[PDB]
Design a binder for this molecule. Structure first.
Ligand SMILES: [Mg+2]
Ligand SMILES: [Mg+2]
Ligand SMILES: [Mg+2]
Ligand SMILES: [Mg+2]
Ligand SMILES: [Mg+2]
Ligand SMILES: [Mg+2]
Ligand SMILES: [Mg+2]
Ligand SMILES: [Mg+2]
Ligand SMILES: [Mg+2]
Ligand SMILES: [Mg+2]
Ligand SMILES: [Mg+2]
Ligand SMILES: [Mg+2]
Ligand SMILES: [Mg+2]
Ligand SMILES: [Mg+2]
Ligand SMILES: [Mg+2]
Ligand SMILES: [Mg+2]
Ligand SMILES: [Mg+2]
Ligand SMILES: [Mg+2]
Ligand SMILES: [Zn+2]
Lengths: 71, 213, 81, 74, 39, 103, 135
RNA sequence: UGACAGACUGAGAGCUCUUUCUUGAUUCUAUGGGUGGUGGUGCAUGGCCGUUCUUAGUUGGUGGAGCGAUUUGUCUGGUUAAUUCCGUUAACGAACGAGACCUCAGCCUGCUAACUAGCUAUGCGGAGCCAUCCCUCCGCAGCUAGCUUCUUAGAGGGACUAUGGCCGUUUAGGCCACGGAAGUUUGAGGCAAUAACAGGUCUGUCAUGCCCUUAGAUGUUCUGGGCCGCACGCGCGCUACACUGAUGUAUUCAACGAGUAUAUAGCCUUGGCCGACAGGCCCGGGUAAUCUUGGGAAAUUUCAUCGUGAUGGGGAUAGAUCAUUGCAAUUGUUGGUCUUCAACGAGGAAUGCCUAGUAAGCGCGAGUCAUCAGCUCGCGUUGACUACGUCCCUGCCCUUUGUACACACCG
């Protein structure tokens, strides 16, 4: 039931693009980093987006990845 | 002495009787709403319209009429309450003004579809994220039918409906029936606050550009 | 409606002094606020002024708001002034 | 204060159990309460942590949280 | 001998808190008075 | 010289009322007054349930209207003019002030 | 004292105490009354009047400021109305008022300022002395 | 225009009449026009509401295909609660719905506090007692607090499937496990698309077209009666058919809400006294976290009595009387007291609701309200059995397929 929707998925890819090196594997630091690169309207949605940037960055740190274009 | 429950209801009912009284008269004036403020030693009734010279009458004759009968009716100390007439900063963003404009066109004898598209493009040209207009009644034929004119964006569910949609319903008494008018106008995110709301849509995001140093 | 000249005269005194007036739908209350009348004479002579368009009547959802109009001030001027 | 009869007995249970370890944490030893806690926890987990369970609100169309008025077709 | 302050209807009337509205005219004016339907 | 003056605040609005509440507190804290507040009072919740239909037909469906009412209290050890010298800032729309002289 | 002893077994002791603590007056309506509107039969026990006293001599001991309109509630209970649903029912005040009257005359309780009925200085003694006389 | 007595009439309605006063151009008479109508038509309408339909569905622009209706987009597949995603791809890029959102509940010995909330300490005061002090329970006040654990209400914090494991196009996601207040979107609700229905509502609305009537009224007002009537069939329910109980003691634990000058105390009503109950008289408190009320709720828990008996289960029916509400109690408003003691022995064919503080049990508050709650909307209290599935019955969504159906298989 926790399938991440388009907004969480799309923002998560897009937010990595603009700030890749600035991110990490920590969910809470990623939550805080995500706090000061955007303006959002709910903390539940923030954790969802930061949740889809944390492990996504393992699969990025592990191998290649789709539309997101890392310099 | 009166308690808090009876107090808050008393203020609320006063607003409704006032606002539903400011529609009987300022119908063909572009009345859009009323701000009932209560200052020390004075209580404000900030009427606001899209045609201010009409509500004032000549040299403030009509406003004299209005303040005094409000004075008398709702038992205020004389010289207590006042009425004021502001102008609406935008006309297209207020469905009350647009519904009444559309009503007066249909009453006068403008063709129905000429009126609805005229309203629709005005509201959009006024800066709205979207507009929606519904007319329902007997047009040219005894069986009733409903026409819907839509433009731009429009939401219908969730909490943000309350803080982004300005909607009005007005009856029209065209001969041989009643055509009801629904004007649903969608506002745009305006941080200044004067035209549109201040918070954005709940699922709108802005990823700030990554400045380089 | 049979209003006395006395009862008639007290209606329109208030009209000049203030300009506005307000009754309710409440029939035969026997004491109008702000004046002395059983509320039927006021209501049904406002209708006489409204029929002859000396008052502008916003029926105000059965709550009877009235504003005296220039057409009738001149005519009501020639009765008690 | 509050609750019923049974709920209070389950309450005093935690009050007694928790109050001991808080006293032990603050005044005896921090590792002399690790023994105490695992006595309480290996028996029942609800002598330290409450039940979040509460009275689900009533909704209309019936006189219960889930129960609905009996339905008749003819 | 108690009717709606809005329409003068004798049925479905709400004296609670001293509104004296019928159950329908109230619903028509509910948000204006300030009764928010939070739930 | 130094009295017991109580300011009572009620409103329908959480955010709006705490705008005024804190301003009064910071108003008088800039005067180093004895400001004992805010004492926060149980929120009253007026309620009406009405049938949604105008005709009593269909699945009987009910809407629960309600109103939150918030109750705030401030204590000032001050004078009847020091209370009014402070409480002259712009009172935000609708917020109810009813300062009285306590015992 | 009072709280270390069973609020039941103790009142048996204090019900045996107002028998043999000299004596007092006793209504010429005692043996007929049902003590409440909703009761079905009058109290079964013959020496119920002192048990009601002993049970209600601890009320003021363990509280303060109870009138008759509150003492009615303390002994009221459910009421079965036959066909219609059952409710709460408030018991009678003639019994409750008079128990107070007797213990007033005997120096266990007194009338209370600020309203109500308040325990005596020396009545507290015996309710604590006989309390000590319970296992 | 208004009236005396009597007739006439329930009527102290002057309604009409006897008679002769009284008001003074207000009116009355006819033509015409208005007005009112809980009168008709929801198959003339608006608005609102329900329902199709609680599911996941709907639609442009440009481009492609077809003479055209139409189609594609909107999908083979995996996944999801979801047209939600991964992807696919003659489509590309968008709009609604879904989600997000909003509200109460579940954690915060961290923050702002708080005598209209309240512990904690100390001063005294009462008692018990190895007793003099100490130990214990209690009541009253304060510059007692390096008071806010408990209560209120603001801020924000916290959960994101985050970490681990197996599964999987090793994608989206699935199952689990330590931790945690919390891992069905944590719980429950609010809002909620397109297209429709000849769905309901003209009896909510001086919302409303047309028609009917408009002074001997379908207008209004008053008296009285009816909506409640009883051979019978139906639906939601209350109380039971008892011992896992009835009664009578003793014992004592909530939460949500509520108190319109209510007139000379008055809505909620404490405390005193009278009274067997019912109910009175008295002093008062509160426009309320302040008084009612920290709402001393019931089931429950104890201790006896009953003993398989239509019994003391059960409480219909009815007789006598008393008290309260109201202008009025009759076709018993209701609450008492005594007496009367019915059917009912777990309910045939059928059939409803329901998956954890849930079902079921128990009581309380609010709406209506002068009085009446077997109702509805909320609240808390005790608190399970079962299942963790399927498409069998009843239905819903999508695809493929057949149709002689299109008011559409009730064809
Ligand atoms: Mg029962
Ligand atoms: Mg009629
Ligand atoms: Mg219809
Ligand atoms: Mg309709
Ligand atoms: Mg095309
Ligand atoms: Mg072509
Ligand atoms: Mg196309
Ligand atoms: Mg949900
Ligand atoms: Mg209607
Ligand atoms: Mg009926
Ligand atoms: Mg029902
Ligand atoms: Mg019995
Ligand atoms: Mg019992
Ligand atoms: Mg009731
Ligand atoms: Mg299932
Ligand atoms: Mg075939
Ligand atoms: Mg055919
Ligand atoms: Mg057939
Ligand atoms: Zn109404």
């Amino acid at each position: 039931g926790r399938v991440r929707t388009k907004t969480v998925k799309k923002t998560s890819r897009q937010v990595i693009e603009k700030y890749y090196s600035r991110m990490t594997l920590d969910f809470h630091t990623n939550k805080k980093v995500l706090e000061e690169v955007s303006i959002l309207q709910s903390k539940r949605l923030r954790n969802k987006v930061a949740g889809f940037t944390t492990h996504l960055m393992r699969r990025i740190q592990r191998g290649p990845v789709r539309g997101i274009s890392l310099k | 002495q009166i308690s808090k429950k009876k107090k808050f209801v008393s203020d609320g009912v006063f607003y409704a009787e006032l606002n539903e009284m400011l529609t009987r008269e300022l119908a063909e004036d572009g009345y859009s709403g009323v701000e009932v403020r209560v200052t020390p030693m004075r209580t404000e009734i900030i009427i606001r319209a899209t045609r201010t010279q009409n509500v004032l009458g000549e040299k403030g004759r009509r406003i004299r009429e209005l303040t005094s009968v409000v004075q008398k009716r709702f038992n205020f100390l004389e010289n207590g309450v006042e009425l004021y007439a502001e102008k609406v900063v935008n006309r297209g963003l207020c469905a009350i003004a647009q519904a009444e404009s559309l009503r007066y066109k249909l009453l006068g004898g403008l063709a129905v579809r000429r009126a609805c598209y005229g309203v629709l493009r005005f509201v959009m040209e006024s800066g709205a994220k979207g507009c929606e207009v519904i007319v329902s009644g007997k047009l040219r034929a005894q069986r009733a039918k409903s026409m819907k004119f839509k433009d731009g964006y429009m939401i219908s569910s969730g909490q943000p409906v309350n803080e982004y949609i300005d909607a009005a319903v007005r009856h029209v008494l065209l001969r041989q029936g009643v055509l009801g008018i629904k004007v649903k106008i969608m506002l745009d995110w305006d941080p200044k606050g004067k035209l549109g709301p201040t918070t954005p849509l709940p699922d709108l995001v802005t990823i700030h550009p990554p400045k380089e140093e | 409606m049979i209003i006395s000249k006395k009862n008639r005269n007290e209606i329109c005194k208030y009209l000049f002094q203030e300009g506005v007036l307000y009754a309710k739908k409440d029939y035969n209350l026997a004491k109008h606020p702000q004046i002395d009348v059983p509320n039927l004479q006021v209501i049904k002579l406002m209708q006489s002024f409204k029929s002859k368009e000396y008052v502008r009547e916003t029926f105000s959802w059965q709550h009877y708001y009235w504003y005296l109009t220039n057409d009738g001030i001149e005519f009501l001027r020639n009765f008690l002034n | 204060r509050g609750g019923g009869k049974t709920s209070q007995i389950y309450s005093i249970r935690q009050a007694i159990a928790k109050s001991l370890v808080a006293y032990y944490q603050k005044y005896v030893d921090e590792a002399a309460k690790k023994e105490v806690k695992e006595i309480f926890a290996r028996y029942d987990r609800t002598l330290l942590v409450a039940d979040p369970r509460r009275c689900e609100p009533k909704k209309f169309g019936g006189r219960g949280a889930r129960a609905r008025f009996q339905k008749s077709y003819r | 001998s108690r009717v709606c302050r809005v329409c003068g209807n004798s049925h479905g009337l709400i004296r609670k808190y001293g509104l004296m509205c019928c159950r329908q005219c109230f619903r028509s004016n509910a948000k204006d008075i300030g009764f928010i339907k939070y739930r | 010289v130094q009295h017991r003056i109580r300011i009572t605040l009620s409103s329908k609005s959480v955010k709006n009322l705490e705008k005024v509440c804190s301003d009064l507190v910071k108003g008088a804290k800039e005067k180093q007054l004895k400001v004992k507040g805010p004492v926060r009072m149980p929120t009253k919740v007026l309620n009406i349930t009405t049938r949604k239909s105008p005709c009593g037909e269909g699945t009987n469906t009910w809407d629960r209207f309600e109103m939150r009412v918030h109750k705030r209290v401030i204590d000032l050890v001050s004078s009847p003019d020091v209370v009014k010298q402070i409480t002259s800032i712009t009172i935000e729309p609708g917020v109810e002030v009813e300062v009285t002289i306590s015992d | 004292t009072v709280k270390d002893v069973n609020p039941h077994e103790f009142v048996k002791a204090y019900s045996a105490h107002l028998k043999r603590s000299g004596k007092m007056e006793l209504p010429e309506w005692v043996d007929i009354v049902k003590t409440a509107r909703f009761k079905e039969l009058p109290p079964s026990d013959a020496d119920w009047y002192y048990i009601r006293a002993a049970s209600m001599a601890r009320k003021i001991y363990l509280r303060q400021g109870i009138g008759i309109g509150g003492f009615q509630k303390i002994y009221g209970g459910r009421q079965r109305n036959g066909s219609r649903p059952p409710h709460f029912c408030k018991s009678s005040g003639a019994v409750s008022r008079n128990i107070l009257q007797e213990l007033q005359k005997m120096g266990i309780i007194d009338v209370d300022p600020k309203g109500g009925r308040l325990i005596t200085s020396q009545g507290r003694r015996d309710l604590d002395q006989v309390a000590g006389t319970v296992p």
